[PDB]
Design a protein around this motif. Structure first.
Motif, mmCIF file in Angstrom:
data_model
loop_
_atom_site.group_PDB
_atom_site.id
_atom_site.type_symbol
_atom_site.label_atom_id
_atom_site.label_comp_id
_atom_site.label_asym_id
_atom_site.label_seq_id
_atom_site.Cartn_x
_atom_site.Cartn_y
_atom_site.Cartn_z
ATOM 1 N N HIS A 1 4.073 6.558 2.143
ATOM 2 C CA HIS A 1 2.629 6.719 2.086
ATOM 3 C C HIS A 1 2.278 8.187 1.899
ATOM 4 O O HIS A 1 2.797 9.051 2.611
ATOM 5 C CB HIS A 1 1.985 6.186 3.360
ATOM 6 N N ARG A 2 1.394 8.464 0.944
ATOM 7 C CA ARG A 2 1.085 9.846 0.605
ATOM 8 C C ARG A 2 0.355 10.552 1.740
ATOM 9 O O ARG A 2 0.758 11.640 2.163
ATOM 10 C CB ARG A 2 0.270 9.886 -0.683
ATOM 11 N N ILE A 3 -0.709 9.942 2.262
ATOM 12 C CA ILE A 3 -1.478 10.583 3.327
ATOM 13 C C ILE A 3 -0.689 10.647 4.622
ATOM 14 O O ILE A 3 -0.778 11.636 5.360
ATOM 15 C CB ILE A 3 -2.838 9.893 3.522
ATOM 16 N N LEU A 4 0.080 9.607 4.937
ATOM 17 C CA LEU A 4 0.949 9.693 6.103
ATOM 18 C C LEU A 4 1.968 10.806 5.944
ATOM 19 O O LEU A 4 2.260 11.537 6.897
ATOM 20 C CB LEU A 4 1.660 8.370 6.342
ATOM 21 N N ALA B 1 1.493 13.491 4.437
ATOM 22 C CA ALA B 1 0.761 14.718 4.179
ATOM 23 C C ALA B 1 0.289 15.410 5.441
ATOM 24 O O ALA B 1 0.012 16.612 5.394
ATOM 25 C CB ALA B 1 -0.455 14.446 3.282
ATOM 26 N N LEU C 1 -7.525 14.289 -0.676
ATOM 27 C CA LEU C 1 -6.696 13.082 -0.688
ATOM 28 C C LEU C 1 -7.448 11.878 -0.118
ATOM 29 O O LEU C 1 -6.912 11.106 0.678
ATOM 30 C CB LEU C 1 -5.382 13.315 0.058
ATOM 31 N N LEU D 1 -4.322 14.515 10.505
ATOM 32 C CA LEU D 1 -5.123 13.624 9.677
ATOM 33 C C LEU D 1 -6.596 13.999 9.749
ATOM 34 O O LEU D 1 -7.300 13.986 8.732
ATOM 35 C CB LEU D 1 -4.896 12.183 10.118
ATOM 36 N N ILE E 1 -4.969 3.875 3.706
ATOM 37 C CA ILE E 1 -3.911 3.478 4.632
ATOM 38 C C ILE E 1 -4.238 3.852 6.068
ATOM 39 O O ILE E 1 -3.860 3.130 6.998
ATOM 40 C CB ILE E 1 -2.551 4.038 4.186
ATOM 41 N N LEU F 1 0.825 -1.213 0.000
ATOM 42 C CA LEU F 1 0.000 0.000 0.000
ATOM 43 C C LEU F 1 0.859 1.264 0.000
ATOM 44 O O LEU F 1 0.552 2.246 0.677
ATOM 45 C CB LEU F 1 -0.989 0.012 1.166
ATOM 46 N N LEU G 1 -7.042 17.013 7.597
ATOM 47 C CA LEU G 1 -7.067 16.645 6.187
ATOM 48 C C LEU G 1 -8.409 16.039 5.802
ATOM 49 O O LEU G 1 -8.946 16.335 4.728
ATOM 50 C CB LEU G 1 -5.934 15.672 5.873
ATOM 51 N N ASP H 1 2.188 4.507 -2.103
ATOM 52 C CA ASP H 1 1.600 5.305 -3.170
ATOM 53 C C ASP H 1 2.511 6.393 -3.715
ATOM 54 O O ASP H 1 2.442 6.686 -4.910
ATOM 55 C CB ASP H 1 0.284 5.937 -2.701
#
Lengths: 452, 154, 154, 450
Positions: B41-44, B46, C26, C17, C43, B26, C20, B28
């Motif tokens: 990880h993109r969201i992590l 971010a 996202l 998070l 994720i 997973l 976001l 990205d």
């Protein structure tokens, strides 16, 4: 650890900010026109980092202020001027939304300035710079501000009278608040003051119009109007406005001419003989908010009670007189038990009036003592009238006359035993309760002594 | 009602993310630092820092790009900062400083700034000129006043 | 060397998070619970619970699917458990129970099971039979022994 | 809160469990053949969720054990058996890896059983169930296991001989550990015991081989051997095997015939007269690990010192005798300072021998007392040999060395001593009656000098 560090060969002596600036300014221009789909954020932030190291952040600062104010002078100002009378407010909010997203992106890609220049040189943030430049350029123009104010004022008036848009006025209200940075100075000087003043004028016109020669309809429809005002403000306008408006309402709609609406011949306090719980309850609950408002209703109530006591006490049959005293007392305490919320001031003024006329007649104590004599000539109900009868006793200041007569009647109610029940004859003493009791007991208890 | 707040959940989620990264599934976003690929990880990556927030969620061209370019930083420094984000633990040694400090000034994460400042605090009277030069360049008030206090103690 | 570990980082990351998610940017996975779409981070929703770990990162067909059909849960329960995962706070009321209880068992998240057990602890001598039936059905040892202790106190 | 709850209208009883067990078994079979790209995970979990909720946990467990063991009987057992001699230990590793990922997926989709049925019925997890069925079914077969033992043994033997793929054995060796659940019982009974046995036999053949009649080469090559073995085990074998293999090496290679390699006429302790620091240091550092090992060298060097001591004491010029005492002492303490690490037992035993023969001479104190007088007949060097001369002094048990006083006259009255100031220092080195009687006569010459 015993290792040397000696690993700092760093130097940023490269004079090429002009190039990194021109590129960054083209990036800002592109973001202003919403072409963000093709700009490399990492490279843009790199351009920003280099100027920080080169200490040319001031050039980026002055340049950022210049580029944002240039985009506001051209393609925002006359963008809304050309729509000043056509689809206005919507264009202003749209332009504001586009500017907000643009400045969010600009702060995002120039975020280093917000961390080491803005913080360490005591200057406004990039987001706050955008808000301030919007507040100084688009609004407070002198033509945009005048038109914006009028549109909001006219719309909120037509809504007060017609149906108008509510989303836009809410958006503009929110924009005016957030344009005041932390505070609401823009709101206060742009929409709060004109709206409050025009509402004052409108409500003064409505105050002169409403007085039409009615009280129940007038007070109910004033309640409807204030409820409508608070509902509208909570719906469209912003929350901090809801305090001063309501006050102004209660300053101009009822307290402006409160004295002339408490009494009017044709319609609530003047004819309280109707006895309707709602009729006086609504009027009380609607005058409760105004400071000093309770005083005028107390004065009207006091005047009526004084007139009634004068009319009824002034002699007359011995028993119907006291019957009138008690029935008027019951009717008047009914109001305070079911119309009002047992207000302390109202109870006090009724008590004072009752202490006025009841003691004004010197025969009252004689009649109060006779009441029992007529009473003694269901048993639980008789106990209830004792509580009501005991209420006046506390009010009398001439209870000496009462007990002296009650002792004179004590003989008449004892020797031939006019009293129906002997056991209660002690109970009335218990309610009455030494010298107030023993002298009333010395004669009776003697008849208990000689009964053996 | 009474809402229930659990404290261990945050660290549990962090360990779970660490396990997910170790399993290497997973992923990205892939970053090229200096020709070396590092996957994350993109969201992590971010919500960790504002820089990455304005990168993976800003709305610029960088969104629709699997491979991104992260220059001005060193691969060891990027691995260190990713490790910190993924497990809140920063292994600071002599080698991984002055490239971790410049990377931390890049990405603007206060925690790494403070940790690097402490590390230079521990190993600070022979090379104070260049440290002062670096602190003045990157404009860290805490490092500057601690260096002034150290000079005063000298 | 000495490694520096920060405790506030995990809570800060969860807060970011949440920010976001609130910004609604996202998003990658979308769940159809009962015809209602709820959007979430893949994720983030992959290390919260073992069920979701096997769903997103297990390797089954569910991986390469934007929209995922999830049953055995109510939309309110799904929203509540997502809220817990995103901010570690569980708002438990009368309505969101016996729907959140089964949802917690669906994802097998021990924290939510314990929270539901505590909520049933607080509100439990008029409807003990059905609670006992539910506890026996879902097989919670803690709830059973608490119910036995409550019967003993009766 | 004063609100009723009354919100549990739940009912689920049904006998459709077998129909959905058919679907779950088909799904498990598909996962066995690696077709997981097209199976709905949530639906498979839901099937297991309901299966467990209706209390049909035993049926699901029995079915899972049956399907996994059926897939192990067919498409695993003869899958590796048909490759028993062709590409073995690679096909088995592939089968183990495929089984491991398959059981990971099965535990992932049946995870409910691992939470409320396995935990509340005191049974083994799904992952451990797969590991156990692999340990019982494909290995420990009696043919697959036996061939695995031969392959691993021959490989490590060829490595000691040739080049082999340690990595392949690492996979099987580690698989053997993880097949023992928490412990290493399968490792102990499958590869550890045969490996150690083969190593023992091979090392005993080697031990009877190398004894070729050399010591330095033999000991250096033995050091190379043990270093190879420990590195070999760490690289290819597991990390719990290094200790037993190292002990078997030190037991069977050198401690089997340690007493015969310490003395051999052609080559280290026997001919230590070479004086090479490395020559004896390697032997010390390589017999240091064996318990009781230091004793054999202690006795060998003690015997040599006794033989040297007897000849040295045997008298002879008075000066050359003590010169022999001192330089033999210097040569032997050189070994303890630069060849050994100043071992306490070694120092003690050299001191013991020195205490033995230095007093085995009645005239030894006379010679010891003469030394000073001959010496008294750079000044810093004079102080240095005084420290060495003091070393023997402590060793003498017959100090009652009267002769120092007998000589005291002859180095005083005509003053044979070169330096008077040092003549007091040697008393301090020697240090009341041991000193005053040595001082009473000397200090008298200081008294009459005014």
């Amino acid at each position: 650890t015993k290792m040397r560090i000696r690993a700092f060969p760093m130097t940023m002596d490269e004079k090429y900010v002009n190039s990194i600036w021109d590129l960054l300014k083209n990036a800002i221009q592109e973001i202003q026109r919403k072409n963000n789909s093709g700009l490399s954020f990492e490279e843009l932030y790199r351009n920003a980092y280099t100027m920080v190291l080169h200490k040319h952040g001031e050039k980026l600062y002055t340049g950022l202020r210049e580029v944002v104010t240039e985009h506001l002078i051209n393609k925002v100002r006359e963008d809304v001027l050309n729509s000043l009378n056509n689809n206005f407010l919507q264009t202003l909010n749209q332009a504001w939304n586009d500017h907000q997203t643009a400045m969010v992106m600009i702060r995002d890609i120039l975020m280093y300035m917000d961390r080491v220049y803005v913080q360490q040189n005591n200057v406004e943030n990039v987001y706050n710079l955008g808000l301030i430049i919007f507040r100084d350029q688009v609004v407070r123009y002198g033509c945009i501000r005048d038109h914006l104010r009028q549109t909001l004022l006219d719309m909120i008036a037509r809504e007060r009278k017609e149906v108008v848009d509510r989303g836009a006025i809410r958006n503009a209200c929110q924009m005016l608040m957030i344009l005041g940075l932390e505070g609401r100075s823009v709101y206060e000087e742009d929409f709060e003051a004109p709206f409050l003043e025009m509402s004052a004028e409108f409500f003064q016109m409505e105050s002169q119009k409403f007085l039409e020669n009615s009280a129940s309809v007038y007070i109910k429809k004033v309640e409807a109007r204030i409820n409508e005002e608070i509902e509208r403000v909570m719906h469209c306008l912003d929350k901090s406005t809801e305090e001063p408006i309501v006050k102004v309402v209660e300053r101009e709609l009822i307290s402006k001419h409160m004295k002339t609406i408490v009494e009017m011949e044709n319609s609530l306090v003047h004819m309280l003989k109707n006895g309707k719980t709602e009729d006086l309850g609504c009027m009380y609950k609607l005058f409760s908010r105004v400071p000093n408002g309770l005083k005028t209703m107390c004065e009207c109530m006091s005047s009526y009670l004084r007139e009634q006591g004068k009319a009824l006490v002034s002699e007359k049959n011995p028993v119907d007189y006291i019957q009138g005293l008690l029935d008027l007392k019951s009717r008047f305490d009914r109001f305070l038990l079911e119309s009002f919320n047992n207000d302390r001031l109202f109870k006090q003024t009724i008590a004072g009036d009752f202490e006025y006329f009841l003691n004004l007649n010197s025969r009252s104590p004689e009649y109060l003592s006779l009441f029992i004599d007529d009473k003694l000539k269901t048993e639980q109900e008789v106990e209830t009238i004792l509580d009501k009868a005991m209420v006046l006793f506390r009010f009398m200041q001439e209870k000496d006359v009462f007990e002296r007569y009650y002792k004179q009647h004590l003989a008449r109610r004892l020797l031939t035993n006019k009293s129906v029940s002997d056991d209660s004859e002690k109970n009335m003493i218990s309610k009455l309760k030494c010298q107030f009791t023993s002298k009333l007991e010395g004669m009776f208890r003697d008849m208990s002594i000689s009964n053996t | 009602n009474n809402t229930y707040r659990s404290a261990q959940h945050s660290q549990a989620l962090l360990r779970g993310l660490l396990a997910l990264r170790d399993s290497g599934i997973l992923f990205d976003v892939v970053l090229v630092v200096e020709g070396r690929h590092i996957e994350a990880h993109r969201i992590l990556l971010a919500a960790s820092c504002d820089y990455f927030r304005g990168m993976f969620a800003g709305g610029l061209k960088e969104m629709e790009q699997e491979e991104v370019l992260i220059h001005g930083v060193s691969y060891n420094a990027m691995c260190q900062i990713l490790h910190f984000i993924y497990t809140s633990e920063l292994e600071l040694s002599l080698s991984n400083v002055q490239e971790t400090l410049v990377a931390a000034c890049q990405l603007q994460i206060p925690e790494i700034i403070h940790f690097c400042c402490d590390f230079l605090m521990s190993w600070v009277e022979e090379n104070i000129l260049d440290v002062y030069r670096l602190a003045e360049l990157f404009d860290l008030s805490r490092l500057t006043e601690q260096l002034d206090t150290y000079i005063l103690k000298n």
